[PDB]
């Protein structure tokens, strides 16, 4: 695992092309996330 | 140490988690190649993941971060899709769960868009799709995503395509 950029705790990937995309985020220490909900699902075929 | 508690669909907590899942689906630039073609999900179950040791590990780090960032953890709720979902819920996130070739370096990646995280449930690029039918767009096989509490602290902003 890499390290956060110095003076930071994470990286934010801001979409700069696809205006409909939301952000993605990266952490470099597993202790910085807790898996709070487990969601079981199917994707649905469009009609 | 992990216990999974089923939420009732009548429970407000079920409903708010479902709504975040469904409302953050978008179309992807791959036309559905990695994650499948869909506009919405059939949510079959939502479970709360309860592990005291992992929770304490998290809040300990969250306090450290907070104290380095003017008492602001910058905590978010984000999606994570992974083939290692079963290991993560029992043992926590770690180096084994990182995306080694990710655009932002080897770290653990999370998404605001549930459909982004859906792209990784069967592996990077959707791998070979579901174990049963080898179909990245399988409408039959049950998938699992995590909705996770994430401490961002001071986050480095990367503008990117
Ligand atoms: O949910 C994610 C899981 C992962 C992921 C990547 C590799 C591996 Cl081995 C496991 C999960 O990558 C993402 C990249 C961007 C946004 C979200 C994710
Ligand atoms: Zn299948």
Curated annotation (Swiss-Prot), chain B:
Function noted in UniProt: Poly-ADP-ribosyltransferase involved in various processes such as Wnt signaling pathway, telomere length and vesicle trafficking. Acts as an activator of the Wnt signaling pathway by mediating poly-ADP-ribosylation of AXIN1 and AXIN2, 2 key components of the beta-catenin destruction complex: poly-ADP-ribosylated target proteins are recognized by RNF146, which mediates their ubiquitination and subsequent degradation. Also mediates poly-ADP-ribosylation of BLZF1 and CASC3, followed by recruitment of RNF146 and subsequent ubiquitination.
Portion of the full-length sequence here: 952 to 1112 of 1166
Tissues with expression: Highly expressed in placenta, skeletal muscle, liver, brain, kidney, heart, thymus, spinal cord, lung, peripheral blood leukocytes, pancreas, lymph nodes, spleen, prostate, testis, ovary, small intestine, colon, mammary gland, breast and breast carcinoma, and in common-type meningioma. Highly expressed in fetal liver, heart and brain.
Family: Belongs to the ARTD/PARP family.
Signal peptide region: none
Name of the molecule in the record: Poly [ADP-ribose] polymerase tankyrase-2
Organism name: Homo sapiens
Modifications the protein undergoes after translation, according to the UniProt entry: Ubiquitinated at 'Lys-48' and 'Lys-63' by RNF146 when auto-poly-ADP-ribosylated; this leads to degradation. Deubiquitinated by USP25; leading to stabilization. ADP-ribosylated (-auto). Poly-ADP-ribosylated protein is recognized by RNF146, followed by ubiquitination.
Subcellular location: Cytoplasm; Golgi apparatus membrane; Nucleus; Chromosome, Telomere
Quaternary state and interactors: Oligomerizes and associates with TNKS. Interacts with the cytoplasmic domain of LNPEP/Otase in SLC2A4/GLUT4-vesicles. Binds to the N-terminus of Grb14 and TRF1 with its ankyrin repeat region. Interacts with HIF1AN. Interacts with RNF146; this interaction leads to ubiquitination and proteasomal degradation. Interacts with NUMA1.
Record-listed Zn(2+) binding positions: 130, 133, 138, 141
Domain PARP catalytic stretches: 8-161
